[PDB]
Amino acid sequence: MQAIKCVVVGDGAVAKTCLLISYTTNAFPGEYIPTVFDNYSANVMVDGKPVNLGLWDTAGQEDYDRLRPLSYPQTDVFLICFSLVSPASFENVRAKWYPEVRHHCPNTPIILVGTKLDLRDDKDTIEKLKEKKLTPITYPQGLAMAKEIGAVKYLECSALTQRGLKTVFDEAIRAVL
Amino acid sequence: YKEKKREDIYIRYLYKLRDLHRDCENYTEAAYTLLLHAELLQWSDKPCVPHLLQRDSYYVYTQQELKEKLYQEIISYFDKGKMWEKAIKLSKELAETYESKVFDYEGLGNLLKKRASFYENIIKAMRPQPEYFAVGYYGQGFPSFLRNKIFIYRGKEYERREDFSLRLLTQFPNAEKMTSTTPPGEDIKSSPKQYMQCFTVKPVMSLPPSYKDKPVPEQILNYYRANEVQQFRYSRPFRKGEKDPDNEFATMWIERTTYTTAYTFPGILKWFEVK
Amino acid sequence: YKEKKREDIYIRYLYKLRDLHRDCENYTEAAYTLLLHAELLQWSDKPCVPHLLQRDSYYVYTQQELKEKLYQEIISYFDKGKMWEKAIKLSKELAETYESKVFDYEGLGNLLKKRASFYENIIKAMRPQPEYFAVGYY
């Protein structure tokens, strides 16, 4: 029996914690109960044997860049995160998140993950982004960024639908495996 | 048949079900069914009816002897069923019977050997907990005992909800999933096109008797977390008040849903209708 | 002393007699005496008096623990004393105590192993009967 370290970062405008807690709770979509504390954990089998799991829920704003990297050491995998509907998130990740992550741990299997997969095709959200001159960025350029890092995988999921979310985490666990 | 009280055919299909469960390797459920068979017996000597004298082998078989054989089998089942608490429980009466009615001390020795092994198994290793899901069947195309019904399923040790949902869809055509998970649909309380919904629920803690204050180790409690359970709850998120930006704890109101079913997991069936 | 009820010195000479009987290898009688000692104890937790806290080893020794140790010793004595009926009898309460008060299932396992051995010994082999004589002193 064993456990796995796995950190998750990202800008605070996407609420990755919602995704994490919904997954760990196994709750109905859009029915998660948000707790008060971070750094969730779970115990899942992906293949062969069940494994313990621990998710490092890391606050994403710039200041905590002094405390966040101290948890990076000996993390089996890290999961870089963004919002598929936030070009600003893309700026931050390709510019700040991804570079500093590669800096701190140049040696770690990495998976890029989308968010608000439904909102990527949300017509009202798309028209709002157009009238706000933001782009509901699609997959292929995300794939291009993934190739830019050459991450062991890149996936896109959503919280309101949990689509691929299990696939996300199974890929995450099998990354070590 | 139990309602009709015609016991012999009841036993016949009981054994049928035992065959089925062994085919499924559901050792626990097979053990329970075979126990219901054994429960009819007594520790008396006279074989009262040949009804209990089944077709497997037919000769004298005093109720005492057949009860012994059944208890041995059930003990073996629980042993490979990894449920040693019931194993020890039954072992106790079996040893009682050996030492007070038949006085075959060799049986005492073997049985106590097994009981020691059971205690070792309890204390040393650990066992995964099975997730428990609630299944609400709705519509009209469902069978009579399924239409507008709600069941609780003793899923596998590591059933992610949607895996079990997929398995249930495999059980059924019209595999569509509802999204108003809590409330039923009145139209679908009569409509055809069977509607369902599934979600994990919380196994409400049992009451280990004579255990309320003693500083007992965890292992027995972790066993009681999932097994010998009849109460199940599900929390209901709800926004009630102002949705101020920085805060959500000003609106959280949980409409928990407690579920009681007539029987106690684990049982003869891996599921049961909510009562 | 028992008449005078001064229990501590009573225990002292009780242990003296236990030493004597072991010297004679009268396992049964040593077991009985040590039992009379153990009988004073209870399955409670609080060590009520240090009187029962003898000179052999002196620290906390909750009555529960000392009673356990004595019962183990008496079980061993009866085992080599070839008197397994009393052995099984005491084993029963000892297992009761383990499973209902301390919940150390390892002790359950070892004790039940021994009890099975006892039952085997009863059923399998045989034991000679001691002749009994009447002595009239005059």
Q: What report would you give on this structure?
A:
This is part of a larger assembly, with one copy of chain A (177 residues) and two copies of chain B. Chain A has helices spanning 16-25, 87-104, 117-120, 123-131, 139-149, 165-176; strands spanning 3-8, 41-47, 49-57, 77-81, 110-113, 153-155. Chain A is of the alpha/beta class and 177 residues long. In chain A, helix 2 (87-104) links the parallel strand 4 and strand 5. The longest helix of chain A has 18 residues, at 87-104. Chain A starts with a strand and ends with a helix. Chain B has seven helices and six strands; from the N terminus they run H-H-H-H-H-E-E-H-E-H-E-E-E. Chain B is of the alpha+beta class. Chain B is globular and about 75 Å long. The relative contact order of chain B is 0.11. In chain B, helix 1 packs antiparallel against helix 2, helix 2 packs antiparallel against helix 3 (63-80) and helix 4 runs antiparallel to helix 5 (105-124). The two termini of chain B are 21 Å apart. The B-C interface holds B 105-106, 108-110, 112-113, 115-117, 119-120, 122-123, 210, 214, 216-217, 220 and C 100-101, 103, 105-106, 108-110, 112-113, 115-117, 119-120, 122-123. Chain A: A motif (Effector region) lies at residues 32-40.
Shape of chain A: globular
What class do helices, strands and sheet pairing of chain B give? alpha+beta
Helix content of chain A: 25-40%
Overall number of strands of chain B: 6
Strand composition percent of chain A: 15-25%
Biggest chain pair contact, residues each?
Answer: B-C, 19 and 17 residues
Strand content of chain B: 5-15%
Gyration radius of chain A, rounded: 16 Å
The succession of helices and strands of chain B, N to C, reads: HHHHHEEHEHEEE
Q: Major sheet of chain A: order of its strands?
A: 2-3-1-4-5-6
Q: How would you write the strand order of the largest sheet of chain B?
A: 5-4-3-1-2-6
Spell the H/E element sequence of chain A: EHEEEHEHHHEH
Distance between the termini of chain B: 21 Å
Please compute the radius of gyration of chain B using only Cα atoms: 23 Å
Query: What is the terminal separation of chain A in angstroms?
Result: 14 Å
Shape annotation of chain B: globular
Count of individual helical segments of chain B? 7
Helix content of chain B: 25-40%
Domain DOCKER (chain B): 1-275
Function (chain B): Guanine nucleotide exchange factor (GEF) for Rho and Rac. GEF proteins activate small GTPases by exchanging bound GDP for free GTP. Along with DOCK1, mediates CRK/CRKL regulation of epithelial and endothelial cell spreading and migration on type IV collagen.
Subcellular location (chain B): Cytoplasm; Cell membrane; Cell projection, Podosome
Subunit structure (chain B): Interacts with CRK and CRKL. Interacts (via N-terminus) with tensin TNS3 (via N-terminus); the interaction increases DOCK5 guanine nucleotide exchange activity towards Rac. Interacts with ELMO1.
